């Protein structure tokens, strides 16, 4: 099973699924092999009904599409559509939160309120919205209308791009025509230009993709901004992760998906229903996280993380998961059929994301508490049914310190230098105690033994004194293998990095270091890492493509991950991807994305499936950036 | 060659291309066979990097996607994305025209003006915009801002849906949640819901597709509305079609693509440059049309149509095509490589639609006349080079009567009944002289011998007294085979239909009938057919799904055609498609689209590749509608 996942609790559930004859994601993978090489390489097109068109990577015909589309065009068009799909997901989440905030401050949704008024005012100031003498509710209404305006064309560009990146970066992007005009505008323009008989020049197509990737960035940054207003900005928290956070004696309820608009309410209401759950013979309601909605309540409330991404079915295989409460994105639709075998009540809550065989509870912000109780009573009913059934919860969990929003990181640093908080970080970059910064991001992927790339690469970088930050299911991978436990600093970290982590931790009254890896939140919270990196750029007076900062989507899967890797390149970062995107069928596209884009944005992709080699390549990238700054390396 | 195209001028150019070794669309098709059956059936998914996933139509594994997506989900998600792509194209065209109108009335683009102020005021009234005491420029500014607002969410739904369909139809659609909230909003929501781990219920997915198809309808109707304001509403015109409209002695310039914003200006400026073209030894500039931008200048100015869709390369093979002026959509990118062999200057003009190897002239509405001269001087230079080269223009053309906008049709009818113009049409439906109405729409497709389905089905329907209207490359197919020539009424038409066509024609002072088929314009001008059909619904007090009206996308290709077929179903029409869409891999999806959707919208798809069988099925559909109205059939 270790060839499937390096997570020992997942291995145990894989053995249980095997002997119970429950098909898993890995079984469905094996049944798909060998996979189609045309699609793997990107040399397939179904953009009109003359297709499917495919092109032989090598050999004889077919060499070209029926309409005359070249391999270069076909590959670029497919990639563009994946970027637009990802942008649509992140920005649909953000749009949902914009409407929730508008409703909250119009008196239409009383379960929701402004919890972070400091963040509200700072966002308003960044956007140019006056706050002087204005009521919070009116400021928030203006912030929500600005969020919504950024979806369409108007007399300004997308402000959740142009107000979050340094002016020098905006200038470079504007010169190349890369600043988005409107989030949904760009998504639709991608779909138009990539339809049959439209754009057919690889460079032109790919510049459109870079622009649409900044619409994805805008959606991420908007989603984080609005979620912090509504639910509070994360601060350091301590909790646990992996399947052993489930409890046989409790009603186990997993929140799974992306949008905390629901999950945050579930957390509160589950507290109120403790007695209504004890009367059923439970000890309480034990809310646990899966995927990014789990990260959201982990960062804000310390809710323990059950599992992530590719291994989500394994939470059900324990037999102890009484409900799985779903919104949208990254939910394997298999959970609906597995639920029959495992006794789990699967519940969907969003109109545009249903699964045949699941129970649907329409959620409306106006009824949030009402809906939460309806959902949690179905969970309690399910716990009652498994009275006296054995369960198999692996007794495996890690300790997790998290909650490192950019504000939290700056506050932590400010204990060392109160009026120039970024300076102690920069000081230790210059003196070599911190070699550079690596963000791990994105998914797991069934093609890669689960977590293997994240942990192999992180170990090499930590030993070389790289400051490692993580989000999404990259944060999930590292947390489940001990990388968010300060007890593991001595083992994992180079002496320079250990010295900094200990200095900061002890100055925040800890008697111990910060954890080896800093958890910066959900996938939309990749925007927090952008906030930190742009704040360092502004303090140093240099653009992001001169900083010793890199990113790794080490086991990417979702179209969202492709969009996010692309905006990391577009804002100036060397960006590793550890699974093959469908680009190898065109050398000219590959050369643009891994080489000549450097001349446009300063970032570039590093496509590398071997994780030891990837770690070497990321270190070289960091160290080239150090050299360009005149720093030893 | 008759197995490739039924167009004899295309057959002649196919022989020339063969002996010159110029590869064509049909050669590239043959080189693609056998095509992938997974993609043909819709049983392939590449929506994340765990894929490609495919499902065997029959047999053993694979049976399901890696994430657990069923055949039903995979097929519905692929279809939804095609609908969103089509909507993006039609509505991107409309958006372009909204910005052009705004610029024109702000004094930013003096080559453009309000040419149809009656249409402007009628549109304003339909939208609820006051006109009483307001300047035209201010009315138009309000109309353009309303067009742009319909792309995003706001306090009203998409008005280019809710103000163009009868209230009873809107009510049915609203009850099912099918009215779009915003055009780009719906496109983006499609892309989100169809991404990995989101919507996974075939009915839910397909209802989203129906809603997005009405966003495509809104884009079409907006594009027609704005283009009529700017360039004039079509009235009856007489011209010619097919390759023989090219002239060896002239500078032949083809306008190709979709948006008339450019082409309309080319037509005017080419008139001004006649002398500058005679000085080069031409007789003049001979502007000809390809695809829908050709239809646009055909409908408004009588510009002759050179060719359409699948046969576009053949215009270049004559050797006499000095320039091909491109905007976007439905342009085979092969034209750029063929141009080297044929001496043709291929010019692109829109930033989001370039072709490697073409010459790019950035077009800006503010410089329109300037750009037009630059482009037309490159054309003249190319004519000079082919001095003394032989050309092979097939001496094959048809006569074409066209320009039947809905206003033109109503005015024609009003000669028989001035104050109740729709009544003579309804009278002849009731008495059987007109059996019903069929709209032919959409493309040609290399899978189908060119034009064969359109002409086979049209002949059967005309002999049965069906009133046939056509747009796009369906209009192109029929015009090139004589169906727009009144001289062919006796041969083609049933006695009842001939009697009506003659009665109307003679009352419009013609001494002859209307043509056998009424050309209603470009693809966006399918909206004109909706205007006519909704006007008949309102006069009769019944919804569209009780009228004896059907549609046929007899040789569909483009994602736009899929979107348009879907909104034809959604507004209540039996809708034939004559090529296989990628749905046969899921029986449940097929049954929804061809059967149970009747219970939702009253329309339905008729998937039928044999054209004689298709004509029978369309007649049965018409005659079932007649019976439901109590009419003989
Ligand atoms: S757009 Fe061109 S390459 Fe793609 S399926 Fe259609 S003919 Fe083939
Ligand atoms: S979304 Fe599911 S079916 Fe599609 S490629 Fe990814 S794993 Fe396969
Ligand atoms: S030929 Fe396999 S992805 Fe299309
Ligand atoms: S397996 Fe051929 S279209 Fe994907
Ligand atoms: Fe996520
Ligand atoms: Fe068209």
Alpha carbon distance A331, A315 (integer Å): 13
SS3 breakdown of chain A: % helix, strand, coil, rounded to 5? 50, 10, 35
CA within 13 Å, CB half, B257:
25
- Please count the CA atoms within 13 angstroms of the CA of B313 that sit on its side-chain side: 32
Burial of B290 (0-12, 13-18, 19+ CB in 10 A): buried
Backbone angles phi, psi at B325, to 5 degrees: -100, 115
Give the other-Cβ count within 10 Å of B252's Cβ.
29
Rg of chain A in Å (alpha carbons)? 24
Instruction: Report the nearest-CA residue for atom 4 of ligand 3.
Output: A44
C-alpha–C-alpha distance, residues A218 and A567, integer Å: 10
CA B126/CA B160 separation, integer angstroms: 10
Strands (E), B297-428: 305-307, 321-326, 345-348, 359-360, 398-402
Data resolution in angstroms = 1.5
Distances in Å between the Cα of B202 and the Cα atoms of A554, B75, B583, B593, B594 are 33, 8, 12, 11, 14
| Degrees to nearest 5, angle at CA A377 with A373 and A378 | 120
Instruction: Tell me phi and psi for residue A55, to 5 degrees.
Output: -130, 135
* CB atoms inside a 10 Å sphere around CB A38: 25
CB of B64 within 6 A of ligand 2: the answer is no
List all residues 6 or more positions away from A117 whose beta carbon is below 8 Å from its beta carbon: A136
**Eight-state DSSP code of residue A534:** H
Produce one character per residue of A253-286: b if its CB has 16 or more CB atoms within 10 Å, e if not: bbbbbbbbbbbbbbbebbeebeeebeeeebebbb
- Cβ atoms < 10 Å from Cβ of A323: 28
Q: How many residues does chain B have?
A: 633
Q: How far is the CA of B32 from the centre of ligand 3 (A)?
A: 12
Q: Give the ligand with the smallest distance to the CA of A57.
A: 3
d(CA A283, CA A442): 35
Three-state DSSP class for B162?
helix
Cβ–Cβ below 8 Å for A191 and B46:
no
Q: How far apart are CA A446 and CA A113, in angstroms?
A: 40
> What is the number of other CB atoms lying within 10 angstroms of the CB of residue A503?
17
Say how far apart CA B483 and CA B454 lie, in whole Å: 11
Q: Record the tokens describing residue B475, joined without a space.
A: 């209009």
A67 has binding-site annotation: yes
Q: Is B341 labeled as ligand-binding?
A: no
Q: Can you list the positions of beta strands (E) in A112-169?
A: none
- Closest listed residue to residue B453, CA positions, set B593, B293, B590, B309: B309
Cross-chain Cβ contact B208/A352 below 8 Å: yes
Whether the CB of B48 sits within 6 Å of ligand 2: yes
Q: Is B44 annotated as a binding residue?
A: yes
B327 CB-contact burial (10 Å; exposed 0-12 / middle 13-18 / buried 19+) = buried
Considering every ligand atom shown, identify the ligand nearest to the alpha carbon of residue A259 and give its number.
5
In sequence order, the β-bridge partners of residue A240 are A399
Which residue has tokens 């140019």?
A128
Residue B73 CB less than 6 A away from ligand 2: no
Tell me if B232 CB under 6 Å of ligand 3: no
Beta bridge mates, B469: B439, B518
Confirm if B597 and B209 have CB atoms less than 8 A apart.
no
Classify residue A600 by its DSSP letter: H
Cβ–ligand 3 distance for B35 under 6 Å, the answer: no
- To which residue do tokens 């610029």 refer? B103
The encoded tokens of residue A400 equal 């997790």
Q: Is A258 annotated as a binding residue?
A: yes
Q: Which residues, at least 6 apart from B444, have a Cβ–Cβ distance to it below 8 Å?
A: B308, B309, B310, B311, B450, B451, B473, B476, B477, B555, B557
- E strands within A335-481? 345-348, 359-360, 398-402, 437-440, 467-471
Nearest CB to A52 within list B35, B91, B184: B35
Grouping H, G, I as helix, E, B as strand and the rest as coil, residue B431 is coil
Cross-strand pairs, B33: none
Q: Select from A410, A415, A369 the least CA-distant residue to A265.
A: A369
Q: Which of A168, A179, A159, A122 is closest to A540 using CA atoms?
A: A168
In a mutational test of the A interface, the residue from B36, B68, B339 whose CB has the highest number of chain A CBs within 10 Å is B68
Three-state DSSP class for residue B287: strand
> Cα–Cα distance between B321 and B324 in angstroms, integer?
7
Query: Quick check: A501 and A493 in contact, CB under 8 A?
Result: yes
Integer angstrom CA distances of residue B525 from A193, B438, B530, B531: 21, 15, 9, 10
Tell me, using a 6 A CB cutoff, whether residue B53 lines ligand 2: yes
Phi and psi at B615, nearest 5°, equal -65, -40
Q: Which two tokens stand for residue B275?
A: 């002398």
Helix (H), strand (E) at residue B286: strand B285-290
Cα–Cα distances in angstroms (integers) from residue B464 to residues A394, B74, B111, B606, B618, in the given order: 74, 40, 47, 19, 11
Rg (CA), chain B: 24
Residue B42 has, within 13 A of its CA and on its CB side, a CA count of: 25
Mutation probe of ligand 2 site: the residue of B38, B45, B195, B585 with most atoms within 8 A of C-beta: B45
Is the CB of B51 inside a 6 Å radius of any atom of ligand 2? yes
Q: For A154, which residue in chain B has the nearest alpha carbon?
A: B148
Nearest atom in ligand 2 to the alpha carbon of residue B197 is: 1
Q: Is B523 assigned a ligand-binding role in the annotation?
A: yes
Pairing of strands B44-45, B53-54: antiparallel
Determine contact, residues B503/B416, Cβ cutoff 8 Å: yes
Nearest to B629 by CA among B485, B429, B476: B429
**What is the bridge-based pairing of β-strands B467-471 and B517-521?**
parallel
Cα–Cα distance between B491 and B464 in angstroms, integer?
13
**Residue in A303, A302, A261 with CA at minimum distance from that of residue A286:** A303
Phi/psi-derived region of residue B340, left when phi > 0, alpha when psi is between -120 and 50, beta in every other case: alpha
Nearest residue of B to residue A208, measured between CA atoms = B352
Test B557 with A50 for CB contact under 8 angstroms: yes
C-beta of residue A347 within 8 angstroms of C-beta of residue A326? yes
Distance (Å, whole) CA B140 – CA A362: 42
d(CA B385, ligand 4 centre) in Å: 46
What does the DSSP assignment read for B477-496? HHHHTTTT-GGGHHHHS-HH
SS3 A573: coil
Q: Please, which residues have CB within 8 angstroms of residue B499's CB and are 6 or more apart in sequence?
A: B433
- DSSP E strands in B330-408: the ranges are 345-348, 359-360, 398-402
User: Do B32 and A62 count as a contact with CB atoms less than 8 A apart?
Assistant: yes
| Cβ neighbours for B481, distance < 8 A, ≥ 6 positions apart | B6, B7, B398, B451, B455
Q: How far, in Å, CA of A554 to CA of A549, rounded?
A: 16
Give the closest residue to A441 by CA, choosing from A553, A548, A362: A553
On whether the CB atoms of residues B498 and B489 are closer than 8 A, the answer is yes
CA B491 to mean position of chain CA atoms: 27
A557, closest residue in chain B (CA to CA): B49
User: What is the distance between the alpha carbons of residues B139 and B105, in angstroms, rounded to a whole number?
Assistant: 10
Which of chain A's residues have a Cβ under 8 Å away from the Cβ of B558? 48-49, 195-197
Quick one: angle between helices A183-193 and B183-193, nearest 10?
Answer: 70
Closest chain A residue by Cα to residue B99: A153
**CA A190 – ligand 2 centroid, Å:** 21
Ligand 4 and A36: CB distance under 6 A: yes
Helix (H, G, I), strand (E, B) or coil at B104: helix
Closest Cα in chain B to A84: B191
Q: Which residues of A touch B184 (CB under 8 A)?
A: 151-152, 182, 184-185, 187-188
How far apart CA B296 and CA B261 sit, in angstroms, is: 10
Calculate helix-pair angle for A202-231, A260-272, nearest 10 degrees.
20
The string of DSSP letters for B406-429 reads HHHHHHHHHTT-TT-THHHHHHHH
B126-134 long-range contacts, CB within 8 A, separation 24+: B126/B163, B126/B164, B127/B159, B127/B163, B128/B163
C-alpha dihedral, B376 to B381 to B383 to B385, nearest 10°: -160
The C-alpha of B515 sits at a distance from chain A's nearest C-alpha, in angstroms, of 31
Among residues A611, A3, A5, the alpha carbon closest in space to that of A307 is found at A5
User: Exposure pattern of A513-526 as b/e (b: 16+ CB <10 Å)?
Assistant: bbbbbbbbbbbbbb
- Cα dihedral B518→B521→B524→B530 (10° resolution): -30
Q: How far is the CA of A592 from the centre of ligand 1 (A)?
A: 23
Q: Name chain A contacts of B35, Cβ cutoff 8 Å.
A: 51-53
* Contact indicator for B192, A557 with CB cutoff of 8 Å: no
B276 is written with which tokens?
């500058």
Q: What is the DSSP letter of B341?
A: H
Tell the residue number behind the tokens 């956070």, with chain if given: A245
Residues 6+ apart with CB under 8 A from A55: A38, A43, A44, A62, A63, A64, A65, A71, A74, A585
Cα of B42 from ligand 2 centre, angstroms: 13
Which residues make Cβ contacts (< 8 Å) with residue A373, sequence separation at least 6? A269, A273
Q: How far is the CA of A558 from the centre of ligand 2 (A)?
A: 9
Compute the distance between CA of residue A61 and CA of residue B600 in angstroms, rounded to an integer.
45
Find out whether A48 is annotated in a ligand binding site.
yes
Experimentally determined by: X-ray
For chain A, the domains span 60-234, 235-403, 406-633
């Amino acid at each position: 099973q270790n060839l499937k996942s390096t997570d020992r609790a997942v291995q145990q559930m894989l053995d249980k699924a095997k002997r119970e004859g429950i098909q898993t994601v890995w079984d469905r993978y094996e049944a798909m092999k060998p996979q189609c090489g045309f699609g793997e390489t990107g040399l397939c097109c179904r953009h009109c009904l003359q297709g499917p068109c495919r092109i032989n990577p090598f050999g004889d015909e077919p060499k070209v599409g029926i309409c005359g589309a070249t391999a270069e065009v076909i590959v670029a068009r497919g990639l563009d559509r994946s970027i637009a799909a990802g942008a649509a997901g992140h920005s649909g989440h953000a749009k949902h939160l914009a409407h929730t905030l508008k409703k909250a401050v119009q008196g239409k949704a009383a379960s929701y309120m402004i919890k972070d008024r400091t963040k509200l005012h700072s966002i308003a100031k960044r956007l140019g919205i006056p706050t002087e003498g204005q009521k919070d509710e009116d400021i928030a209404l203006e912030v929500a209308k600005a969020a919504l305006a950024d979806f369409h064309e108007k007399d300004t560009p997308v402000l959740w791009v142009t107000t979050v990146l340094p002016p020098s970066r905006v200038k470079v992007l504007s010169a190349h025509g890369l600043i988005p005009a409107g989030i949904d505008h760009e998504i639709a323009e991608i779909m138009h230009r990539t339809s049959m008989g439209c754009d057919a020049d690889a460079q032109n197509l790919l510049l459109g993709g870079l622009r649409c990737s900044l619409a994805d960035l805008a959606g991420c940054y908007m989603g984080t901004d609005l979620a912090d207003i509504l639910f509070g900005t994360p601060a350091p928290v301590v909790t646990e992760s992996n399947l052993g956070v489930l409890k046989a004696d409790a009603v186990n309820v997993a929140v799974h998906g992306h949008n905390p608009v629901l999950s945050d309410i579930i957390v509160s209401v589950s507290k109120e229903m403790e007695n209504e759950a004890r009367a059923a013979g439970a000890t309480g309601i034990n809310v646990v996280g899966i995927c990014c909605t789990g990260n959201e309540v982990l960062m804000r409330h310390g809710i323990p993380a059950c599992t992530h991404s590719v291994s989500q079915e394994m939470a059900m295989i324990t037999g102890a998961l009484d409900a799985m409460i779903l919104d949208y994105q990254c939910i394997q639709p298999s959970v609906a059929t597995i639920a029959e075998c495992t006794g789990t009540t699967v519940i969907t809550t969003m109109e545009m994301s249903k699964i045949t065989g699941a129970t649907h509870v329409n959620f409306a912000e106006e009824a949030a508490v009402e809906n939460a109780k309806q959902i949690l009573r179905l969970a309690i009913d399910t716990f009652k049914r498994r009275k006296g059934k054995p369960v198999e919860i692996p007794n495996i969990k890690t300790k997790v310190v998290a909650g490192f929003s950019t504000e939290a990181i700056i506050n932590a640093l400010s204990k060392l230098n109160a009026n120039d908080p970024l300076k102690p970080l920069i000081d230790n970059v210059v003196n070599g105690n911190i070699r550079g910064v690596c963000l791990f991001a994105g998914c797991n992927n069934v093609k890669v033994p689960q977590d293997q790339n994240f942990t192999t690469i992180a170990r090499k970088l930590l030993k070389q004194n790289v400051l490692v930050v993580a989000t999404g299911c990259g944060a999930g991978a590292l947390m489940r293998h001990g990388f968010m436990d300060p007890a593991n600093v001595d083992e994992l970290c180079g002496d320079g990095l250990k010295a900094v982590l200990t200095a900061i931790g002890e100055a925040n009254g800890l008697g111990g270091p910060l954890p080896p890896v800093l958890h910066m939140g959900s996938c939309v919270d990749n925007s927090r890492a952008v906030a930190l990196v742009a704040a360092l750029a502004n303090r140093l007076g240099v653009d992001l493509d001169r900083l010793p900062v890199v990113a790794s989507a080490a086991e990417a899967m979702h179209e969202k991950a492709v969009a996010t890797g692309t905006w990391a390149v577009t804002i100036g970062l060397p960006t590793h991807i550890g699974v093959l995107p469908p680009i190898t069928g065109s050398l000219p596209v590959t050369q643009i994305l891994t080489s000549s884009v450097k001349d446009i944005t300063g970032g570039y992709f590093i496509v590398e499936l071997d994780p030891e080699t990837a770690a070497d390549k990321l270190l070289a990238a960091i160290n080239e950036r150090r050299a360009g700054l005149g720093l030893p390396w």
